Design a protein around this ligand. Structure first.
Ligand code: SF4
Ligand code: MG
Ligand code: MG
Ligand code: MG
Ligand code: MG
Ligand code: MG
Ligand code: MG
Ligand code: MG
Ligand code: MG
Ligand code: MG
Ligand code: MG
Ligand code: MG
Ligand code: MG
Ligand code: MG
Ligand code: MG
Ligand code: MG
Ligand code: MG
Ligand code: MG
Ligand code: MG
Ligand code: MG
Ligand code: MG
Ligand code: MG
Ligand code: MG
Ligand code: MG
Ligand code: MG
Ligand code: MG
Ligand code: MG
Ligand code: MG
Ligand code: MG
Ligand code: MG
Ligand code: MG
Ligand code: MG
Ligand code: MG
Ligand code: MG
Ligand code: MG
Ligand code: MG
Ligand code: MG
Ligand code: MG
Ligand code: MG
Ligand code: MG
Ligand code: MG
Ligand code: MG
Ligand code: MG
Ligand code: MG
Ligand code: MG
Ligand code: MG
Ligand code: MG
Ligand code: MG
Ligand code: MG
Ligand code: MG
Ligand code: MG
Ligand code: MG
Ligand code: MG
Ligand code: MG
Ligand code: MG
Ligand code: MG
Ligand code: MG
Ligand code: MG
Ligand code: MG
Ligand code: MG
Ligand code: MG
Ligand code: MG
Ligand code: MG
Ligand code: MG
Ligand code: MG
Ligand code: MG
Ligand code: MG
Ligand code: MG
Ligand code: MG
Ligand code: MG
Ligand code: MG
Ligand code: MG
Ligand code: MG
Ligand code: MG
Ligand code: MG
Ligand code: MG
Lengths: 148, 231, 137, 208
RNA sequence: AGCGCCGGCCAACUCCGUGCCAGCAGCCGCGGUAAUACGGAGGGCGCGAGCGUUACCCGGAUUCACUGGGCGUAAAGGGCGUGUAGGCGGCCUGGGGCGUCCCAUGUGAAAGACCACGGCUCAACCGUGGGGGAGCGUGGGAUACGCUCAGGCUAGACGG
RNA sequence: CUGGUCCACCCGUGACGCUGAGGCGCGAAAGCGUGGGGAGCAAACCGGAUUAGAUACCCGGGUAGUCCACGCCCUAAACGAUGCGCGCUAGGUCUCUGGGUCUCCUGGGGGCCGAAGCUAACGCGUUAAGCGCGCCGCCUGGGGAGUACGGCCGCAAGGC
């Protein structure tokens, strides 16, 4: 099993004659607090199905984040559309310093020490993905040498 | 197993309607046509077959796809011969990516073979017989080579990767490695184990797919002698 | 042409992003000294002085990672990132104590110093500073 | 000054017993034993999902409520920890611990930190000889924490000294009963205390 | 023992009264007879000899962007040329060493700040010690890039 | 009479280059001054219709003007709503104009479709809106307002 957090749940709507009709959107991150996180956004005619379906995709999309004493190996900046995420290495005491969105991802990934900043569009969805694709580009001292 | 005058069989084709990633597999261009270096085709047939072999000798499945009219029939022959699945007719969308749902249609196919072997009611109305049977032929047309697939292939073999881009797509999303014969209109990097050859001439579609099936049986348990080819 | 150096680095980035085996940049005993860092640190296979239409060039041999699994089989880059720091528009100079740590050590900053072209590591070693040519990782 | 009101509602709101009383804390007449739901008209109503903000406030209030300390004083310590070398969460708990009135309650001289205050405040306590009646004295390693000689002979302190005879006391402390004196051995490793506090969530409260 | 708050942001919910009125309000917005949003009440949350409001400064504001933004359609390319100042500038070789970089040395008061210790029962406050810095003067040194002088070249540019 | 520009030859010069605040020139139409010219057209204006009305649309008329010379004005959806130069990053098809060994190749233009990549999207994509360097111009919520004041230009209208 995995540990799960609901980052976002939103109602959307579409028009047709006679009225508007809703659908729900569930941004869920899921992880083991020991180097494995997954982000999934799930939509359905009702709330919990969406939260379920979210969690489903969440697993069907993971990433192996190279923790290091609970911090990430290096500075990293990523832009997903107009959203930007900054990740910066932090020493033992620091805590996770971030907004909920990139927090929820970093805690459930087992980060315990990091400095972050959102820049640009701070739409949670895009920020979510931007933080994921960020982690996904983390490299270790090894990773680099093997590569080169 | 490999043979060498496939030059008598194909040497490829297609004028500048080419994809340029396929540059490396081209010697020169002749009658206003791209001519495929056979020496490269060799280098590759080997490395491809090596992969094919390992898969047979571990008893692992191959999905055979070809629907361009030319490679159409020769996949019913060559794949049945290997006791392996194929899609001959239309390549339904989501066969790998939505396997369990597509297959939920094969249980229907079986279920008609069982129901329509006889009897368990022929006291069902005249129209329904007609109706149900019409359905039966239907599934049979597309799903015939598919039922042999009871699990996600351990690989897939494709005749035109360009033409069967959807197929290659579905595999890559699943990490199912892709084997294909591919003439100069194709994106090479998109294939894992690659056969740079004419993909439109049945001469060639024949040679390559057969010797494939041959290597499939020869390493699986047996050997066999000539199989069917239309003149 | 206003920045021979940037021009080079860009010729590389541009090539590396469509996965060319090599690309040639117009030769310079300074451009070379930078490639001599780029290869040594293992960012490129290396370079060789060639000629194109009678004119001196440096053919630069590019390096990447394995083929990959997934719908996008393109390999990771070895040069993920390379960009001018100092430029003709704004020369950028650092004393030794203020040489940046690129990417937590995993990348380098080539620098022209009066003890030749060095990396951060190398500079700090001989303990000198200089114009910060660029950054790679 | 400090909280000085109904103290059971605290535990009830925090959803956890904080041992803010001494004796009654351990009986089945404890509030949290009878009504382990939050104080007031609405405690029986079904809780709705606490916000991230909510959560960290609560954790901080809890850690704070334990020590009965004013919010300013709490804050000033936490900052002090953020300038102080090492892991802030540790040092914060450590510095919270090195307070006189806590050490006194730690070394068992009283049943409630509340009672352990009035003890220091009423000058019944001493450190290294000298009398000290400041509940906030930051106690260092080596310090001898006595009962006042003139206070040694008192009912309350007697009854409370008697309850300590073979009760073992944190790895960072020594207690010499009869001799009525104790010792501050070192600053507490985090493990050495086991409070219902994710002190991490506290750092996070103050980083907003 | 007081003061603010309990619609969302933001921690804290029920009853009555009122009925687009009286009123709240920092933004979104609340009130037209079942208002968690007005007023009172019970209850709750936050602080506590304080709590709140108003004003002003930095912050959040990567919203003047050096770090660290932009200009087809969101605000944003000059109507187009020509050209002064300026800014910027190809390959090779030497001299100079202005920028740049290194070392030494002077200066960089005291207080403050930072680390240690110590005195007022603690603290605030206060004392003793320690640690440096940019920056600028001076002496010495380096020469890759920028500069400058000098000599070559032909890939830029110009011409036949 | 005269400008731009492209090709081929690879003959000459030896970085003589890029951009460019100011400045200077050019700048559709309408408009303006003086003098011509005036067939067609046609603001203004007259009348007929349409219409609830119809200072319009439609119909019959009609003067500036439209045309020429000389001097002004200096605007614009003056648009690719895309500043200039250079270098680098797949190709496919149509086309204009050169030079070739004339199947085909190679330049310089004009279109479409598209690799990578970009982009909020729409779309851009060797004619970049891609990846980069140089310089210039410009944006910083909507209205108020391209208004006011001041200054400079203009015969005025008006422009900056
Ligand atoms: S623990 Fe002591 S303080 Fe908390 S409720 Fe039970 S009794 Fe009151
Ligand atoms: Mg990894
Ligand atoms: Mg975004
Ligand atoms: Mg962007
Ligand atoms: Mg570190
Ligand atoms: Mg926002
Ligand atoms: Mg084909
Ligand atoms: Mg910079
Ligand atoms: Mg306890
Ligand atoms: Mg949390
Ligand atoms: Mg600290
Ligand atoms: Mg305890
Ligand atoms: Mg802060
Ligand atoms: Mg308040
Ligand atoms: Mg608050
Ligand atoms: Mg709340
Ligand atoms: Mg009233
Ligand atoms: Mg009411
Ligand atoms: Mg309110
Ligand atoms: Mg109320
Ligand atoms: Mg006070
Ligand atoms: Mg402000
Ligand atoms: Mg903030
Ligand atoms: Mg700022
Ligand atoms: Mg900037
Ligand atoms: Mg902006
Ligand atoms: Mg323009
Ligand atoms: Mg103008
Ligand atoms: Mg000049
Ligand atoms: Mg100059
Ligand atoms: Mg130069
Ligand atoms: Mg000098
Ligand atoms: Mg100094
Ligand atoms: Mg000083
Ligand atoms: Mg300092
Ligand atoms: Mg002291
Ligand atoms: Mg001092
Ligand atoms: Mg020199
Ligand atoms: Mg010269
Ligand atoms: Mg030339
Ligand atoms: Mg010549
Ligand atoms: Mg110019
Ligand atoms: Mg000008
Ligand atoms: Mg004009
Ligand atoms: Mg005119
Ligand atoms: Mg006119
Ligand atoms: Mg007039
Ligand atoms: Mg006139
Ligand atoms: Mg006239
Ligand atoms: Mg009329
Ligand atoms: Mg009329
Ligand atoms: Mg009329
Ligand atoms: Mg008319
Ligand atoms: Mg007329
Ligand atoms: Mg007339
Ligand atoms: Mg007139
Ligand atoms: Mg136009
Ligand atoms: Mg143009
Ligand atoms: Mg404009
Ligand atoms: Mg605009
Ligand atoms: Mg310009
Ligand atoms: Mg620009
Ligand atoms: Mg031509
Ligand atoms: Mg010709
Ligand atoms: Mg033109
Ligand atoms: Mg063209
Ligand atoms: Mg297009
Ligand atoms: Mg694409
Ligand atoms: Mg093209
Ligand atoms: Mg754009
Ligand atoms: Mg405004
Ligand atoms: Mg305003
Ligand atoms: Mg005006
Ligand atoms: Mg105007
Ligand atoms: Mg005026
Ligand atoms: Mg203008």
């Amino acid at each position: 099993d995995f540990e799960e957090k609901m980052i976002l749940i939103r109602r959307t709507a579409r028009m047709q004659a006679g009225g508007r009709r809703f659908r729900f959107g569930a941004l869920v991150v899921v992880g083991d607090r020991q180097g494995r996180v997954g982000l999934g956004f799930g939509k359905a005619p009702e709330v919990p199905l969406a939260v379920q379906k979210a969690g489903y995709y969440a697993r069907r999309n993971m990433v192996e984040v190279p923790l290091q004493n609970g911090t990430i190996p290096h500075e990293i900046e990523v832009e997903f559309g107009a959203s930007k995420i900054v990740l910066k290495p932090a020493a033992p005491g620091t805590g996770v310093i971030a907004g909920a969105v990139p927090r929820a991802i970093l805690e459930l990934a087992g980060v315990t020490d990091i400095l972050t900043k959102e820049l640009g569009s701070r739409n949670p969805i895009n920020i979510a993905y931007a933080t994921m694709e960020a982690l996904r580009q983390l490299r270790t001292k090894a990773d680099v040498e093997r590569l080169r | 197993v490999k043979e060498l005058l496939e030059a008598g069989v194909h040497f490829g084709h297609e004028r500048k309607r080419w994809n340029p990633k396929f540059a490396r597999y081209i010697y020169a261009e002749r009658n206003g046509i791209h001519i495929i270096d056979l020496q490269k085709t060799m280098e590759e047939l080997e490395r491809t077959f090596r992969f094919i072999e390992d898969l047979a000798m571990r008893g692992g499945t191959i999905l055979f796809v070809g629907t361009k009219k030319q490679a159409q029939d020769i996949v019913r022959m060559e794949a049945e011969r290997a006791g392996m699945p194929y899609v001959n007719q239309r390549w339904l969308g989501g066969m790998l990516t939505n396997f369990k749902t597509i297959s939920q249609r094969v249980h229907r196919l079986e279920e008609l073979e069982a129901l329509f072997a006889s009897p368990e009611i022929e006291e069902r109305p005249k129209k329904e017989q007609v109706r149900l049977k019409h359905e039966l032929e239907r599934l049979q047309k597309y799903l015939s080579g598919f039922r042999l697939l009871k699990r996600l292939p351990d690989a897939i073999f494709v005749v035109d990767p360009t033409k069967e881009a959807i197929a290659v797509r579905e595999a890559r999303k699943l990490f199912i490695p892709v084997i294909a014969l591919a003439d100069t209109d194709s994106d090479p990097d998109l294939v894992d184990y690659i056969i740079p050859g004419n993909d439109d001439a049945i001469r060639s579609i024949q040679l390559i797919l057969s010797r494939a099936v041959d290597l499939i049986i020869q390493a699986r348990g047996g050997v066999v002698e000539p199989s069917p080819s239309y003149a | 042409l206003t920045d021979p150096i940037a021009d080079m680095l860009t010729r590389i980035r541009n090539a590396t992003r469509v996965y060319k085996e090599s690309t040639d940049v117009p030769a310079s005993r300074f451009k070379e000294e930078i490639l001599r860092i780029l290869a040594r640190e293992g960012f490129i296979k290396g370079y060789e002085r060639v000629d194109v239409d009678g004119k001196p060039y440096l053919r630069v041999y590019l390096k990447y990672g394995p083929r990959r699994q997934g719908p996008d089989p393109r390999p990771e880059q070895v040069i993920h990132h390379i960009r001018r720091i100092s430029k003709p528009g704004r020369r950028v100079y650092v004393g030794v104590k203020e040489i940046p740590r690129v990417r937590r050590g995993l990348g380098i900053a080539i620098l022209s110093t009066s003890k030749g072209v060095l990396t951060d590591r190398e500079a700090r070693k001989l303990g000198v500073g200089g114009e910060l040519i660029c950054e790679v990782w | 000054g400090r909280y000085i009101g109904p103290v059971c509602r605290l535990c009830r709101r925090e959803g956890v017993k904080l041992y803010l009383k001494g004796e009654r804390c351990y009986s089945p007449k404890c509030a949290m034993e009878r009504r382990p739901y939050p104080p007031g008209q609405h405690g029986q109503k079904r809780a709705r999902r606490p916000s991230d903000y909510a959560v960290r406030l609560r954790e901080k209030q809890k850690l704070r409520r334990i020590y009965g300390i004013s919010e300013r004083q709490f804050r000033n310590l936490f900052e002090e920890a953020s300038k102080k070398k090492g892991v802030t969460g540790s040092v914060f708990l450590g510095l919270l611990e090195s307070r006189l009135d806590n050490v006194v309650y730690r070394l068992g001289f009283a049943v409630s930190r509340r009672q352990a205050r009035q003890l220091v405040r009423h000058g019944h306590i001493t450190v290294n000889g000298r009398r000290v009646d400041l509940p906030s004295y930051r106690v260092r390693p080596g310090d001898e924490i006595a009962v006042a000689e003139k206070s040694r002979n008192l009912e309350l302190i007697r009854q409370n000294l008697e309850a300590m005879k073979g009760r073992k006391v944190g790895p960072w402390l020594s207690l010499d009963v009869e001799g009525m004196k104790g010792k501050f051995l070192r600053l507490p490793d985090r493990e050495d205390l086991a409070l219902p506090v994710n002190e991490q969530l506290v750092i996070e409260f103050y980083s907003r």
